[PDB]
Structures are given as structure tokens and as C-alpha cells.
């Protein structure tokens, strides 16, 4: 859970040397003692002393606190990678601000990965960070010459590893694609990203990022990862019992020589041999605890990244004052052709309009420029107060007024109910005479065919079939005169036959 | 400058005052039952004071009486795509041993996940089993663990405003005015008040004209291009899969960018299937632009033409086809409105100039009068039939009023008075008859006329001939005899030649 090669150092010198070793195993043994910070301080910051007082590496505080990539030990921090030979950490710059993260009181040095690279901040001897982090305040507490491990801070969670380079052609297509995800970010830490002709006050935002090594990194929002154990040729670092790491010559020979005691995982690959031996183990070891190496599968093409992290960052947001409006129309005018107004629009076409007449309303046909609107025919007399309201395309709302002249006492109907109550104008004044003449002519030749009926009655022809039914009714009535004769005769005869006694 | 449907308001409830250089001032509480009248006219609330010889009016004017809808609730629907992320591990570390160690997944069990950001949206973390071994990239011959997270995002940036409602009760728009100088327009609904503006609340009572077919239907309206439609939708809160309303959100500040909090969504919309080593997901959501019964701006559902009206509240209106009728009424409730009375009499005299217009019509007859006044009082022109009020100005001016007559000649006498100077005027003119308007193709009406005159449509004497004949009692008889004689001889003289055209078909050719 953090102890990789050995326990925590103690140190005795007030100002020692830290000689540079050549063995990679010796290097990985050295990292666990928290010496990269000391090398970064004694080389450039001029500070004399040592960091990580009997605390080791696992006790370094993290701003995320409870976070992944920390329960393991094989992951490489950016400082370890930098001391392993990758890109040099840039010096502190006055144009880079500090994200308002955790409390900085009591800390002595921290680092932050930016868009261009990685930066680090610290103070000289006898000074420490304040609660905010603008200046180094002198404190008597940091004067005993010993600095505990918790005073070194790291921001965000990161994993860095060797990567396979790619041609630039497959990289640029990423940068454009990542720029289509956020049409809001314009400038990040003074680095152009888009063209918005306007900035705003930068605000912190926490995102993930992927490092390729060709340009100013890549911002990550959605992506699928894949952990691969690999462990092909060189993934194991180890030591001896108590003494520490073995010699460089032993490490070089162990991969090619014969009998080399070790874990069965290393045994199955190295080419180990077995035989009678004693307690003379030749740097026996195993495989270092780490999940492996990460790959990224962004929409098709895949790439192994140099670094992979999640942290806070400084950026701006686009701002635009779109509130301008337009007004209403541009010199529209209202006409009146026949029984209805006619709207005219010059700026653009008409989407929908609602004409309000004296005692009616109507909706425009919509679609054209010089639209025509017709009301109900029959009642548009007198002087009106036409009032229109509507909206055009491209977001404009327009209202207008106006009027026109319409017939006052003109109706102009041919033959309906509108005339019989009005014989005074009735459109053509010399028109009632036609009605009078026609009606009197029809009245005279609608009574002439009544005297013919009166003198020659047409029902006498039907007076020949009714007497037929009367004859049948009479025959039915006189039918009954026979039964009252025959039955009575039979009854009288039967009575007379039996009346003799 | 006109009025109609007087109610004379209510007196004896006013409480008089005094001070500040005349201007008696008053406060009143009461009620009224002004009629609805047709859209275009106005009904007023002529006030009175027991002592002062001045009055102030309160007129209600209606423009549109359309069939707008109610509003149970409102919400904002954003369009959403589907996004997914996946992470593969190997069974070598001390973090995972076999799938999910507990009964159910808790928190996220890992960092870097796209759920700690701001634009991520709602998510559902899950774990599953995938391939493991030498062929896949693990050092253990056991199935590996796959951790997947699914969410939704909103590229573009459209936003839909939805209001589920099935009432469709008649409504109207009115232009209320205070007595002094104020004018404000608002829209009452048939059953609910319209809030207190300055002490006057006016509510409408309709007839509840049922529509033919209208199930649960919601008016949806885009907020970028302003495109309106009617589509089925569910009530606020619960989201049933199938209709619009699955990405329910309430605030147009977190609707464009979907946030974890602020609104509620359902599951089974971003369903994820696991591959051999990764995870890819496809959305089952349906955009609101095509769901079911998605209509457009012009529609003819039932017997009502649902056009689009340009207002501030309820921007979807129905409309009848030919004329139709709705019999409703307003009910003004005034609580603490204040009115100022001059308490000074002034000269007021005038006479009419001309009358013209309709018979018993839908608009009445306009009468134009000319007045010479030295005050700001309100006239009270009254007659045998209707009565009207308006506002007179300083100096000499002319005004027009609407009076509804019944016969084809006007000779009545009025009793015009403004302030304190009751006098007499006269009337004179001729009027014509114009019937109810017909229907003509190409016109889409958008109003519910609230009154139609019928039952007095018959031909009449003593005017059927005044433009046909002379003018006089004996002239009528002389003209009748003349018109009877004018044609009898002509008709009965053609009898001689009638046979010449009648017997050709019945005799030799
Ligand atoms: C910190 O100081 C040490 C001490 O010189 C530097 O170590 C040197 O590294 C170079 C190349 O890596 C070697 O050629 C030298 O032999 C090293 N010096 C010694 C004394 O062994 C180290 O490079 C410095 N780190 C910096 C400047 O970032
Ligand atoms: C470090 O300590 C050793 C003795 O342990 C001493 O010889 C050496 O000079 C010290 N290094 C210094 C003082 O730089
Ligand atoms: C949509 O139209 C179909 C057509 O028949 C109808 O049956 C259905 O009820 C309509 N949908 C809704 C939600 O009313
Ligand atoms: C009626 O009088 C008014 C004066 O206000 C005048 O404008 C109008 O033309 C007159 N109309 C007729 C028909 O005399
Ligand atoms: C009377 O009315 C006119 C016009 O409406 C106005 O200018 C004037 O101020 C009014 N009189 C008073 C005393 O306010």
C-alpha cells in the first residue's frame, strides 16, 4: 500500500549530495524515499534540507483525498517520470494562476499539470504557504530542519508511462473533433482554442485529459479505457533481503543466465533453473503490483497515451449580448381593394397576421409578400378602424393601424331577403318596377286558369269512379236482406213442425 | 367615445369625503352584472354621487372571445442523445475480486468517471462480466470485470415548452380602464378571476360549448423558431414511455444542459449491451417532432379551425366556422377604487348634426353631436330606447355615439345633460336595413359572436311603395288604380293575335 522497495528514510546530513545512480532498479528504490522533491529543491530552489521525514511515499497528501490510482503502488507520478527521463517540467511562470483547491497552510511544495505541461511551486527556507497561496509567509515552525511528508502536495490523479508515437496526421483529426464537443470554451490559460471575439473571467473546472506529446494535450469527456497487464520484457523491479537492490551486473545477467531464484511468474518467463542450493538467493523477487497500462479507444482509432489524468483547470466561457431586437416592419402600408384590406410587407415574407375589423376578425393566408385578406361579404359599410397585429420571419412583431372608404348605403344584392324590406335604393333604383310588372302579370295569368275550372269543373271526370264504390256499398247493404229471410224461414219451419203438440 | 348596455352601477354605498381644494373624493364597494355584448362594442359602469353633479365611467371593451385552453402545469423538454463510457480491469489487484463485492453497486468504486463533472447529466453506473485470459489481456483465467456508465447529452440546443391541459373553456381579451386615465388589457377565463389591478376584478361566465373530439392534448411550442403544434402528452411528474415527456424538466436554466438535480427522468431509455471488452449503447427515445397525432399550425380538428393567435397568455386559439353564438356575461367586483368629483356645475349645451347607419343591426346607428363645454364632465345622453355616455372636452368639439333604433324614421327627443345643465336636443334622419353577413370562401373567422338579431324579418307596408308611388293618402289609391289599369288593356288586346301563334301547331302548316 505504498511501500515499494523498502521503508522510509531517516537521513542525518544537514545538506547531503544525493549522488546520481545509473541502475534503473536503484532509481526505483530511490523514488520511494521521497528524493525527487529534494532534487527539485536543492538544484534550483537553493533550499537546504530534506523532505519526507520518516514518512515514505504512501503518506503524501492528495487533494482529491479518497481517490483511485493511489491504493496501488506501481503507478508513476509525474515527478518520478520526469526523473526517469521524459519531458522536463517547466519552470514556474507568473502568468499561471493557482486553482482554489484545498488548504495550503502548512504545505511547502506542490505541482499542477497545465495545458502546456507540468508546473511546480514552492518557497525558500523559513517560509511556508499561507491559507490562500499568494505569498510565502515566514513561520518559526518550519525552522527545525526537518519537513514531514504531508507538507508535499500533489493535485489531481495521474498515471504516466512510456507511449508509442503516432504520425501527426492521426493526431490533428483528434484536436478538431474534441473542439466540436464544447462550443463554449474559447481560451484556456492564454492558449487560443477558437475564435469568439470575446472573453470572460476564468473559472475553475474539473476535467480529464490525455497526453500524446505532439501539442497542448487533449481534453477528455467521453472515452473507453482498457487495462492491459502486458509485462513483456521489463516490468519487474526488486531487491535483496535487507541489503536492498542488487547490482546492475546481476540485473543484466539474470535475464540471460541460468539458475535464478524468483517467483513462479518471473520463473515461467525468465528461463529459471532449479537444483540443490542453500540460503544464497540471487536477488529473488516477483512482479510489481500495478494494474498495468492504459489504452484509449476514442471512436475508431486507438492510441496508447503518455499521460492520463483527471484534475482541475482554468478556462473561460463565451459571452454574447444577443439582445438587439428589430422593431416593426419597414414602411408597410394598408390598402383597401374590395370587401377586404390588402397587407403589404417589404422587409420579408409574412408568417401569420390577424386583421381586426370593426366587428369581425380574420387570419392571413401567409406565404407571400402582398397577401390578400377577405372578410365576410355583406357587412363592411361605413368608416372602419382597421388594426393589424402579427409576426414576420426572423423574429419581428409588428402592429399597424389605418382605414379606408367603403360604401355607406350600398348593398347590391340580386334577389334575397335583403331587398324586400328595402325598396328605396335597392342598388338600381329602377328595379322594383320589373318585380311589380312580373308579379302582376303572373297574378293575372294565375287566375285566368281558375275561371276555366269554375265553369268547367275537373272533378266530374272523377265523378264516375266514386259511384262505382257507391254501387258496391249499396250491393253490400242490400246483401243482408237475404239471410234474415232464409234463416228466419228455416227457423219458422222448424218451429211449426214442433208446434203441433 | 361611446358606451352601451348601461347598468347605472350602484349608489348609496359610496362614502363621501372633503378636502384639498374641492375634489370631494370617494371610495366604493359593490358589484355589477354588465352584459357581454359583441366584440367591438363596450359595456360601462356609470357611477354617481348623491351630492356632487359629476360622474365617472368604467368601460369594458372586448376584442377577441376565442376558445383558448386552460393550464394544469408547464415544463420544458430538451432533446437528448445517448452517450456511454466503459472501463475494463483485470483480477490481479486488491480492489475487485468477483464482480460487485456487495449486494448492490454503491457510489462509483472508481475515479475519472464522467459523473463528477458538470455537464454529465443523470447516470446509472453498472458492472458486468466480460472475457478474461491471455487472448483478452488478463493474467488470470477468470472472467474480467467491466464497469459502464450511461448518460444523455444535449448538443444543438432546442428547448420545448409544454403545458398539459384538457379543459378548452371559452375565454376573451378585454381592455379595462380606470375612471381617471388608466388603460390595461388582460384576458379573463370562464370561471377564474384576473387578479386585482387597482381594486377591480372582472370575471367572465360562458356557456361551456362542448367540442366534438378532444382527448388529452397538449400545446407544444419551440422557443427558437416559434413553431406550435398539438400533441398528446402526460401529466406533470410521472413519465410514461411512448409520448413526449420522458426527459421532464421544469427550469429553463438546467433544461438545455441536463443536470443531475432539478428534474426527474425514467430508466429503460439508455439501455446498454456489453460486448467482449467494451460497451456501446443505442437510444430508445423518440423526438417530439414525430410521435403521434403531431399536427401543425393550421388544423381542422373537429368542427373548429385551430389557428395561431399572437398574444401573451395561451397562444393557441380555436374558432367557429360560420357565426355561432355564446351567451355569457361579466361580473365586475370592485373593492377600493377611488374616484374624484369636481363638485362644480358648468355650462353644457349642444345639438345633433346627423344620424346614419343600420336598421335593427349588429352595430346600431351612429349619431353625431356637437358640444360646447367648459369642464371635463361626462354626458348622459338618454332617450326612449338605449342611453349612452362619453367624455366631453374643453371648448367646442364633436362626438359620435351609437343608438339602436327600430323603425325607418327617427323623430324622437333626447334629454342630454352633462354635469348640471339638463337640456333638450332633437334627432332626424333616414335609415336602411342590412341583414346578417353571409359566409364567403377564403375567410377564416376567429371570433365567437355573442349576439345575433333574429325574429323581426318580415316585409312591411307604408314603405314598400314610398319609392314606388307618390306621397299621400289619395295618391296611394290613385296610383293603385293607375297601375292596375296600366296593362289590362295591353294583355287583353293580344288575345286576337294569340290564336295566330297558338293554332299553328294544331292546324295546317
Ligand atoms: C539535479 O542535480 C544533479 C546533480 O548534478 C543532476 O544530475 C546530473 O545529471 C546529468 C544528466 O542526467 C549527469 O550527466 C550528471 O552526471 C549528473 N550529476 C551528478 C553529480 O551525478 C541533475 O540533472 C539535476 N536535475 C535537474 C537540473 O533537473
Ligand atoms: C554527509 O555526511 C557524511 C558523513 O556521513 C560527510 O562525510 C559528508 O561531508 C556529508 N555531506 C555534506 C556535508 O555535504
Ligand atoms: C391519433 O390518431 C389515431 C388515428 O386513428 C387515433 O386512433 C388515436 O387515438 C390518436 N392518438 C391520440 C393520442 O389520440
Ligand atoms: C355627418 O356629419 C359628420 C360630422 O361629424 C360628417 O363628417 C359626415 O360626413 C356626415 N355624414 C352625412 C351622411 O351627412
Ligand atoms: C380636462 O381635460 C383636458 C383634456 O382631457 C386636460 O388637458 C385637463 O388637464 C383636464 N383638466 C384638469 C383640471 O385636469
Author numbering:
A (entry chain A): 21 to 521
B (entry chain B): 561 to 1069
From the study:
The severe fever with thrombocytopenia syndrome virus (SFTSV) is a tick-borne human-infecting bunyavirus, which utilizes two envelope glycoproteins, Gn and Gc, to enter host cells. The viral genome encodes a membrane protein precursor that undergoes proteolytic maturation to produce two glycoproteins Gn (the N-terminal half) and Gc (the C-terminal half) embedded in the viral envelope. It has been shown that Gn plays a major role in binding the host receptors, which induces the internalization of viral particles into the endosome. The acidification of endosome further triggers conformational changes of Gc to enable the fusion of endosomal membrane with the viral envelope, allowing the viral genome to enter the cytosol.
The ectodomains of Gn and Gc both display an elongated shape and pack in a parallel orientation, of which the Gn head is slightly twisted to dock on top of Gc domain II. The β-connector domain of Gn constitutes the major interface to interact with Gc within the heterodimer, and domain B forms an appendage to cap the fusion loops at the tip of Gc domain II. The Gn domain C displays an Ig-like fold and binds to Gc at the hinge region between domain I and domain II, which facilitates stabilizing the metastable prefusion conformation of Gc. The structure of Gc in the prefusion conformation adopts an arch configuration in which domain I folds towards domain II, creating a valley at the hinge region. In addition, domain III tightly packs against domain I to make the structure in a compressed conformation. The energetically unfavorable prefusion conformation of Gc is essentially maintained by interactions with Gn as well as further assembly of high-order peplomers, which may explain the failure of crystalizing Gc in the prefusion conformation. The interactions between Gn and Gc mainly involve two discrete interfaces, mediated by the Gn head and domain C, respectively. At the top region, two antiparallel strands in Gn β-connector domain pair with the b-c-d strands within Gc domain II, resulting in an extended five-strand β-sheet, in which residues T245-W247 of Gn and S646-R648 of Gc form a hydrogen bond network involving both the main chain and the side chain. In the lower part, the Gn domain C adheres to the junction region between Gc domain I and domain II, and the long membrane-proximal linker loop of Gc inserts into the cleft to further secure the interactions.
